[PDB]
């Protein structure tokens, strides 16, 4: 039941990139990361996510 580290890569069509690094459970580091994107859609547009490296890498790309 040990905690994990998840890499959240964030790219906007605005010509700028951002990154976030969450620590917690397999669900506490994932729902916080998706909520961080949810609080950005309202100021950007819809988004997509590509799960990689056993779930430890979340590549988020906004459509715009």
Determination technique for this entry: NMR
- Every domain of the chain and the residues it spans: 1-64
Is 2 annotated as belonging to a binding site? Answer: yes
Is 53 annotated as belonging to a binding site? Answer: no
5 Cβ neighbours under 8 A, 6+ residues apart: 21, 22, 23, 29, 56
**Under a CB-based contact definition with an 8 Å cutoff, are residues 63 and 47 in contact?**
yes
Distance CA 61, CA 10 (A): 6
Is 61 annotated as belonging to a binding site? Answer: no
Is 28 annotated as belonging to a binding site? Answer: no
What CATH number is given for 1-64 in this structure? 3.10.20.10
CB-side neighbour CA atoms (13 Å) of 1: 0
Alpha helices in 1-64 (DSSP H): 31-41
């Amino acid at each position: 039941m040990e905690e994990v580290t998840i890499k959240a890569n964030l790219i906007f069509a605005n010509g700028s990139t951002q990154t976030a690094e969450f620590e917690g459970t397999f669900e506490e580091a994932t729902s916080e990361a998706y909520a961080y994107a949810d609080t950005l859609e309202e100021d950007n547009g819809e988004w997509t996510v590509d799960v990689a490296d056993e779930g430890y890498t979340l590549n988020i790309e906004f459509a715009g």
